[PDB]
Design a protein around this ligand. Structure first.
Ligand SMILES: [Cl-]
Length: 64
């Protein structure tokens, strides 16, 4: 497991406005939970706590 921004295709974060939406998105994807980060490494986007290692996360580079 790891803590990170889960990615929607293709290498883009999931933009957000509330913690509840991210918590729902993160746990649907196997996380322990999640919240909206407005000023993290990629800026705005859902951040997930203890996401399974196989689920796609945002990595350096481009979002298509
Ligand atoms: Cl890791």
């Amino acid at each position: 497991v790891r803590d990170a921004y889960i990615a929607k295709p293709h290498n883009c974060v999931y933009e957000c406005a509330r913690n509840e939406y991210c918590n729902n998105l993160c746990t649907k994807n196997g996380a322990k939970s999640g919240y909206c980060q407005w000023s993290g490494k990629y800026g705005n986007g859902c951040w997930c706590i203890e996401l399974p290692d196989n689920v796609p996360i945002r990595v350096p580079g481009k979002c298509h």
